[PDB]
Design an enzyme around this catalytic site. Structure first.
Site, PDB file in Angstrom:
ATOM      1  N   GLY A   1       0.832  -1.131  -0.057  1.00  0.00           N
ATOM      2  CA  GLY A   1       0.110  -0.151   0.197  1.00  0.00           C
ATOM      3  C   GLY A   1       0.531   1.337  -0.043  1.00  0.00           C
ATOM      4  O   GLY A   1       1.948   1.477  -0.806  1.00  0.00           O
ATOM      5  N   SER A   2       0.239   2.345   0.903  1.00  0.00           N
ATOM      6  CA  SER A   2       1.134   2.979   0.449  1.00  0.00           C
ATOM      7  C   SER A   2       2.966   3.400   0.979  1.00  0.00           C
ATOM      8  O   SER A   2       3.212   4.705   0.866  1.00  0.00           O
ATOM      9  CB  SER A   2      -0.354   4.120   1.591  1.00  0.00           C
ATOM     10  OG  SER A   2       0.380   5.962   1.449  1.00  0.00           O
ATOM     11  N   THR A   3       3.134   2.434   1.871  1.00  0.00           N
ATOM     12  CA  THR A   3       4.405   1.924   1.616  1.00  0.00           C
ATOM     13  C   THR A   3       5.086   2.414   0.246  1.00  0.00           C
ATOM     14  O   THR A   3       6.403   2.982   0.334  1.00  0.00           O
ATOM     15  CB  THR A   3       4.834   1.451   2.851  1.00  0.00           C
ATOM     16  OG1 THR A   3       4.300   0.341   2.081  1.00  0.00           O
ATOM     17  CG2 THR A   3       4.555   1.301   4.071  1.00  0.00           C
TER      18      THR A   3
ATOM     19  N   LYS B   1       7.346   6.324   6.444  1.00  0.00           N
ATOM     20  CA  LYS B   1       6.228   6.412   5.536  1.00  0.00           C
ATOM     21  C   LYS B   1       5.692   5.665   6.366  1.00  0.00           C
ATOM     22  O   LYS B   1       6.072   3.816   6.427  1.00  0.00           O
ATOM     23  CB  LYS B   1       6.121   6.061   4.191  1.00  0.00           C
ATOM     24  CG  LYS B   1       5.485   6.095   3.519  1.00  0.00           C
ATOM     25  CD  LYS B   1       3.919   7.275   3.804  1.00  0.00           C
ATOM     26  CE  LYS B   1       3.077   7.507   2.702  1.00  0.00           C
ATOM     27  NZ  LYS B   1       1.476   6.648   3.425  1.00  0.00           N
TER      28      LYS B   1
END
Ligand SMILES: [Cl-]
Ligand SMILES: [Cl-]
Ligand SMILES: [Cl-]
EC number: 3.4.16.4
Length: 495
Positions: free
Chosen positions: A244-246, A435
Site C-alpha cells: 500500500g502507501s509505503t 511512511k
C-alpha cells in the site's frame, strides 16, 4: 564370515556467531550411546537394567531390539552428557558403545530463532542460516574402513583412518543487541493491540547487512516439542503483502526521475475520491484540494499518487520498484524465501496504473521493503543484501539517481516531522524519515523508514496484524529506531 563397513566420523560443525562474535549456534560435544543389536541379542538379561538406565519402557525397548536383531547399529540415546554416557558404559553391556557427537545449541533462543534456524537430528541445517550455509558450516566427515565379523564386531581397520575436517566459523550480519531490542518492542506492540503476528527488519543501508530480523509468534529452537506452524514462519522473509502507501515514495521517485515533477508541484485531489470507469479511488483523509508531492505522502492520498501515475505512466513506476528490488529475486539463497510479485504489465490501464502507484498492485516481503528503503536512504545506491558479516563491501548499484534519492529522503523526513504527519514515528535526538501504510493480504499496519536523515545509517520496516499504520506500527519504529541508533553509536543529527 565378514563385512567391511565404512564409518563416518562426525565433523565439528562451524560456530555461528552474530557480527560481534556472540554465539548463536554452537556444536557442543555430546556422548551418544549406540548398540550393535547382534551383540545385544546375546545379553538380553542386561536389557531391563539398560532400559532403566535409559529411562525407557522395558517392553518398547525389548521390542525395538528384537525388531532390529539383524542390524549392526542403532542409537539408544543421542546427545547425552559425557558423565551420563560413562554411567552406562560402566554397566559393560555387550554391544553398547559410546561415541562423541556434536549437538547444536542456540544460546539466544527464541530471540533469533527464525534467522539462525536449526539443524536436524543428523546435524544438517533445516531452517534459516543453518540450512542456507550448511556446506560452509558442515565441514567434512572423517572415514574409517572397518573389518567386522558376523556379530558384527570390529576386527581391525583396513586402512588409515581419514580424519574429519571441521566446518568453518560463520559470523552473521545480525547484531544480537539490535535483534533483541526489535524482538521485545514488536512483542509488546502485538500484546497491546491484541494482534496475533508481526515482523520487524533492520538494515545497514551502507553495507547491505541485515542487522535485525524478528517475527512474532516465535519459538525456542532448543525445544521444538510443542511447536506450531504459525510460530515457525520467518515472516520477514516469507509473508507477502500489498505494501500500500509505503511504496508511494518509489512512485514519487519515478515522478521525479521522469523530469515532469518537482517536490513543490501540485495535484488537486478534491473531494478525496476519483472516478475511474466503474471504479472509485478513495482517500482515507478527504479534506484536501491541492497537495504537493510531500502533501500526497503526508495525507496518503491515493487520488494524488494516482493522478501522478497517470501523468508519468506506470512503466516508470514499475522500473523504479523493480530496480530497488520490490518483488524481485534479491534473495540471499534461503530456500523458501518469497519473492512476491511485481507484474510487468508492459502497458497498464488506468485502474492498474493507479493501484500499482498506491501500492496495492504488487506483493513484497518486509525484507524487500527494507532493502528498497535502504537504497533510498543510501542516496539511491543499493548495496547487495547480506545475512553474513560484510568486511569487504561490494560496490553498490545506482538504482535511483542520487539527486532523486536525496529529494525523496527529504519528503519522507517531512511526513514524520510535519504538521498532520506521522508524529508518532518521530525519534528524539535524530531526524527520522518514513511512511505509514495499511498492508493487505486481512490487513496489517505498516511503517517503513530510516535514520538519521543527514547521513542515513539504518532502514527499518515494522509490520503488525491489524484486527492503522501511523497508530500501531509508527510508535514501534520510533522506539526501536531510538534504541538501534544509539546501540550503533550513531551521533544524533538534530543539531
Ligand atoms: Cl527439540
Ligand atoms: Cl503462504
Ligand atoms: Cl565480505
Amino acid at each position: 564370515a565378514r563385512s567391511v563397513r565404512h564409518i563416518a566420523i562426525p565433523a565439528h560443525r562451524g560456530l555461528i556467531t552474530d557480527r560481534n562474535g556472540e554465539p548463536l549456534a554452537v556444536s557442543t560435544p555430546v556422548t551418544t550411546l549406540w548398540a550393535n543389536p547382534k551383540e545385544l541379542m546375546t545379553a538380553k538379561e542386561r536389557w531391563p537394567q539398560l532400559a532403566a538406565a535409559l529411562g525407557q519402557d522395558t517392553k518398547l525397548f525389548a521390542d525395538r531390539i528384537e525388531q532390529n536383531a539383524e542390524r549392526e547399529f542403532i542409537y539408544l540415546v543421542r546427545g547425552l552428557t559425557p558423565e551420563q554416557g560413562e554411567g552406562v558404559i560402566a554397566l559393560k553391556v555387550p554391544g553398547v558403545y559410546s561415541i562423541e557427537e556434536f549437538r547444536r545449541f542456540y544460546p539466544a533462543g527464541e530471540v533469533v530463532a527464525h534467522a539462525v534456524g536449526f539443524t536436524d537430528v543428523d546435524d544438517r541445517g533445516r531452517e534459516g542460516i543453518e540450512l542456507a550455509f550448511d556446506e560452509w558450516l558442515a565441514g567434512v566427515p572423517g572415514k574409517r574402513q572397518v573389518l567386522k565379523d558376523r556379530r558384527g564386531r570390529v576386527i581391525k581397520d583396513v586402512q588409515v583412518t581419514k580424519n574429519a575436517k571441521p566446518g568453518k566459523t560463520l559470523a552473521l550480519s545480525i547484531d544480537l543487541r539490535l535483534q533483541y531490542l526489535a524482538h521485545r518492542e514488536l512483542r509488546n506492540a502485538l500484546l497491546e493491540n491484541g494482534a496475533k503476528a508481526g515482523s520487524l527488519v533492520i538494515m545497514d543501508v551502507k553495507t547491505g547487512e541485515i542487522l535485525a530480523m524478528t517475527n512474532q509468534p516465535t519459538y525456542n529452537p532448543n525445544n521444538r516439542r510443542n511447536l506450531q506452524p504459525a510460530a515457525m514462519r520467518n515472516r520477514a522473509m516469507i509473508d507477502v503483502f500489498e505494501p500500500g502507501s509505503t511504496v508511494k515514495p518509489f512512485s514519487m521517485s519515478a515522478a521525479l526521475a521522469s523530469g515532469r515533477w518537482k517536490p513543490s508541484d501540485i495535484v488537486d485531489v478534491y473531494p478525496g475520491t476519483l472516478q475511474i470507469g466503474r471504479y472509485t479511488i478513495r482517500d482515507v483523509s478527504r479534506n484536501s484540494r491541492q497537495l504537493d508531492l510531500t502533501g500526497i505522502l503526508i495525507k496518503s492520498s491515493n487520488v494524488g499518487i494516482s493522478k501522478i501515475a497517470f501523468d508519468i505512466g506506470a512503466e516508470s513506476i514499475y522500473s523504479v520498484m523493480q530496480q530497488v528490488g520490490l518483488g524481485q529475486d534479491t534473495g540471499l539463497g534461503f530456500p523458501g524465501e518469497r519473492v512476491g510479485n511485481l507484474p510487468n504489465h508492459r502497458k497498464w490501464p488506468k485502474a492498474e496504473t493507479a493501484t500499482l502507484a498506491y501500492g496495492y498492485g504488487l506483493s513484497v516481503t518486509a525484507i524487500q521493503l527494507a532493502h528498497a528503503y535502504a537504497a533510498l536512504a543510501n542516496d539511491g545506491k543499493s548495496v547487495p543484501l547480506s545475512m553474513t558479516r560484510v568486511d569487504r563491501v561490494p560496490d553498490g548499484v545506482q538504482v535511483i539517481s542520487p539527486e532523486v534519492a536525496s529529494t525523496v529522503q527529504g519528503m519522507l523526513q517531512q511526513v514524520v516531522e510535519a504538521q498532520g504527519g506521522v508524529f508518532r514515528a518521530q525519534v528524539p535526538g535524530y531526524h527520522a524519515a518514513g511512511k505509514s501504510g495499511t498492508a493487505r493480504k486481512a490487513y496489517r499496519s505498516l511503517f517503513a523508514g530510516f535514520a538519521p536523515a543527514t547521513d542515513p545509517r539504518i532502514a527499518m520496516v515494522v509490520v503488525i496484524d491489524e484486527p492503522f499504520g501511523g497508530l500501531v506500527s509508527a510508535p514501534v519504529f520510533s522506539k526501536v529506531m531510538a534504541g538501534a541508533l544509539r546501540l550503533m553509536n550513531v551521533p544524533p543529527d538534530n543539531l
